[PDB]
Each structure stands twice: as C-alpha cells, then as structure tokens.
Design a protein around this ligand. Sequence first.
Ligand SMILES: Nc1cc(-c2nn[nH]n2)c(S(N)(=O)=O)cc1S(N)(=O)=O
Ligand SMILES: [Zn+2]
Length: 229
Amino acid sequence: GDQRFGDLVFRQLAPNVWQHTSYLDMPGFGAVASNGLIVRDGGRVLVVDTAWTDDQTAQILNWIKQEINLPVALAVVTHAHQDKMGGMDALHAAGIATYANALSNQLAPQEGMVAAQHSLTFAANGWVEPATAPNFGPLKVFYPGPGHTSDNITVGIDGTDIAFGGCLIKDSKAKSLGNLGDADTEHYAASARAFGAAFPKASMIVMSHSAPDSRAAITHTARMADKLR
Ligand SMILES: Nc1cc(-c2nn[nH]n2)c(S(N)(=O)=O)cc1S(N)(=O)=O
Ligand SMILES: [Zn+2]
C-alpha cells in the first residue's frame, strides 16, 4: 500500500488522491512524520502542504513527475509551521503558485518561514473568499477558527469523501492535542467541530501526524479540546 520514494512515503487514498509523508529526526525523540496531499484534477496536480524541508519537497515534485507526469498548478499550505511550510523555496524554484491564509503569510517571518506568494481570505463563517482561491478545482478551503494555531486552515476534496484537517485534527486514539505552543485552548473545541460541520459527508479524515482515520478523529479531538476550556 505504502510506496517508499527517497526519504518520503506515498499512499494512494483515492484514484486521484495521494498522501505524502516526510520525516524530521528529532534528537532523543525519534523521527516525526508529517502528512500532506497530492490531488490530480484532470491535466494538472494540486498539492496541500510542503514537506519539512526544501529537499524533501523537491522529492515530492520528483515523485509527481515520475508517477503522474502532470504539472503542479498550485499548492495550498495549512499554517506557518515547519511541517507545513518548510519547503516553500522548492515550490517557488519550480514555479508553482503558492497560497496560504493571509494570517499564515503575515506570521511566516516570525515563525522562520517564507510566505506563500498569494493570500487566501475568509468569510465570517470560515469559507474561503472564492476570488482569493482562483481555479482551485476540487480544493474547498475552510478556516475553522483558531485551534492548533490562530491561522490553521483545512481542505475538503470535492468529488471524494476525503477532508484534510492538517494539524488541527488528531486521530481517534490520540492521547493529547500535540504541540499547544501556538494554540488557542479556548476556541479549539469549537474549531474542531466547525471543521466536521463544514465537510459533514467526509468519511476519510486525513491529518498531519497520523494515518487517515474515520470521523471519530474529529469527535475525539473535540472531546480532548473540551478539557482545555
Ligand atoms: N512533534 C511536533 C508536533 C507538532 C504538532 N503539530 N500538531 N500538533 N503537534 C509540530 S507543529 N505543526 O510545529 O506544531 C512540530 C513538532 S516537531 N517539534 O517539529 O517535532
Ligand atoms: Zn503546527
């Protein structure tokens, strides 16, 4: 099921969707996995999140070239942390248009990241303003509210039963909400539930640090976050 390519792992989730996995070795802690997505939309490819580094992200582009052999139209990055935006330079060097929440772009310098080249903005209910997400095809971007970070965004894949929660969502058997360093403990539970309500028919929930899970990943994350309030 899992395909090893260089230092990365690729898993096909649907006929047109793959999960990319990259690892960062943390001294005395062990290797930390981070997941993103690759979506084929006809004659082009769309990417959600970079890998931890530029070299790992260049390896994602190399896998796309070999396995799909279609051009990457754009990438969406889900917040200004290393696991999601660490490889922006490799996207830019390749000529790929990059998009992130305007807030992620504003926080990127303080977070030691390079901003995406375009900014997404959101309505009062969390849905992306469509003029800011042109020709996004099946990528349905939703800002669920502050949680893992104040800028965290999520992506539903239209035409599939998949939705990507990024670092906001943890798996159904997680014992904690992960790095809470930049988190909004007050609003986390409502943000997790808002992601679930935005994509109510998504049955496969993809996240940054666990393998794809059922909707119990959303409800369990919300239940752990209810304890932070
Ligand atoms: N272990 C780890 C977990 C998280 C995490 N993400 N979501 N929940 N926790 C993050 S993140 N996205 O930066 O906040 C980074 C690391 S590290 N120190 O780079 O290994
Ligand atoms: Zn993060």
